[PDB]
Design a protein around this ligand. Structure first.
Ligand SMILES: Nc1nc2c(ncn2[C@@H]2O[C@H](COP(=O)(O)OP(=O)(O)NP(=O)(O)O)[C@@H](O)[C@H]2O)c(=O)[nH]1
Ligand SMILES: [Ca+2]
Ligand SMILES: [Mg+2]
Ligand SMILES: [Mg+2]
Length: 166
């Protein structure tokens, strides 16, 4: 059984915890409890192989930025999340991509760019703007809604695939 170390990163409140908890426990967390650092594990079949998903749900609050170097060293693939109704979170995710590369000394780190909260109509980040950012890093872009489950499995299983094929 192959184990995959997934890490979910991004700015405060973009929905990292809601995304992970939707994938693992199949319900939507409506309240907003800011995360320090939580771990989840789950056995799943992906392309006919049983996998162990080890998911790290990380802090978006700038307070805990010191914890970053460690978890980027350890993790194998990174789900990099912004919210489509938060332009600043899109500008911020760019800074996360550079840190992952820097910390891991590699321009080829398995990553997926995720535009979350796509159920909301107050969009300020157009899909094409995020596509352009993902293209310059050579990584996929997938929109999600933790609330409706749209794209949630697609995003996480795509990241597994990127790790697998690394
Ligand atoms: N409509 C909608 N709301 C969402 C979605 N994802 C998260 N939210 C809401 O946004 C708030 C923040 O979500 P949360 O998962 O805690 O974000 P976070 O990125 O983990 N925050 P932190 O970095 O502080 O730990 C919650 O009220 C949650 O219900 C989504 O896809 N759609
Ligand atoms: Ca709920
Ligand atoms: Mg959280
Ligand atoms: Mg604009």
């Amino acid at each position: 059984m192959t184990e995959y170390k997934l890490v979910v990163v991004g700015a405060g409140g973009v929905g990292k915890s809601a995304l992970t908890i939707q994938l693992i426990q199949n319900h939507f967390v409506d309240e907003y409890d800011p995360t320090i650092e939580d771990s989840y594990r789950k056995q799943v079949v992906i392309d006919g192989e049983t996998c162990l998903l080890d998911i790290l749900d990380t802090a978006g609050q700038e307070e805990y930025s010191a914890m970053r170097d460690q978890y980027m060293r350890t993790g194998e693939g990174f789900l990099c999340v912004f919210a489509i109704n938060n332009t600043k979170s899109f500008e911020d995710i760019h800074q996360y991509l550079e840190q992952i590369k820097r910390v891991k000394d590699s321009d080829d780190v398995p990553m997926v760019l995720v535009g979350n909260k796509c159920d909301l109509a107050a969009r300020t980040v157009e899909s094409r703007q995020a596509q352009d950012l993902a293209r310059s890093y050579g990584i996929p872009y997938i929109e999600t809604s933790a609330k409706t489950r749209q794209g949630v499995e697609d995003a996480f299983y795509t990241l597994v695939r990127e790790i697998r094929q690394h």
